[PDB]
Design a protein around this ligand. Structure first.
Ligand SMILES: CCNC(=O)Nc1cc2c(-c3ccncc3)ccc(Nc3cccnc3)c2cn1
Length: 191
């Protein structure tokens, strides 16, 4: 009840939270917000590589090789830690609220865990979708076409420019950018 309140307020006044929704600046801020959390995981010393991928279906994904977002459940509440992070209130919860769809995949403790959201509403509980020995977090989102106008597609240059800065403002962090639309790719890292 409290969560759906905060996500409505973001949806109601998105410019407040993400930046201008009509000129691409807010659209691309969506990506940097997701990346910021992967950066924090790298600064804690747990993540060595961040990969940002522009797909051909109007989505972007951000992957890291960190510890993975926690997957534990509150016994008496049911609601998973991952869900709380994605829904509670700039932070990913804002990206989630302004995403037509968002997919979270976590590799942690020998399992792959997945949860889907639509406009920030979880479609089902976090669930096991496989096994792995890798660890890390993958967030993929499709921006709301009710929120964003004029520039609704991700632009490589805007991403490349800010990902490069992010790598030199937190040096030792490797950030790769891949565009599946045309095969363009970059690796940003500084010593
Ligand atoms: C591709 C995006 N990557 C990412 O969010 N990495 C990440 C985030 C963690 C967070 C977090 C996420 C979003 N907003 C705020 C915080 C919290 C905790 C993590 N892991 C963790 C921390 C402490 C103990 N156990 C797991 C995260 C790991 N990777």
């Amino acid at each position: 009840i409290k969560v759906l309140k905060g996500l409505d307020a973001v949806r109601k006044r998105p410019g407040m939270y993400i930046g201008d929704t009509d000129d691409g600046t807010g659209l691309h801020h969506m990506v940097f917000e997701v990346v910021d959390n992967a950066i924090d995981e790298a600064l804690a010393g747990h993540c060595k590589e961040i990969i940002v991928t522009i797909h051909a279906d109007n989505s972007v994904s951000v992957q890291d090789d960190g510890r993975g977002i926690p997957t534990g459940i509150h016994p008496e509440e049911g609601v998973s830690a991952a869900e709380v992070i994605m829904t509670v209130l700039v932070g990913v919860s804002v990206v989630n609220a302004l995403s037509q769809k968002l997919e979270l995949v976590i590799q942690r403790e020998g399992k792959i865990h997945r949860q889907i959201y639509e406009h920030g509403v979880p479609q089902a509980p976090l669930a096991v979708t496989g096994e792995t020995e890798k660890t890390g977090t993958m967030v993929r989102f499709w921006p709301s076409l009710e929120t964003f106008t004029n520039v609704t597609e991700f632009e490589y240059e805007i991403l490349a420019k800010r990902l490069r800065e992010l790598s030199f403002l937190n040096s030792g962090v490797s950030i790769r950018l891949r565009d599946k639309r045309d095969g363009k790719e970059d690796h940003f890292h500084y010593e």
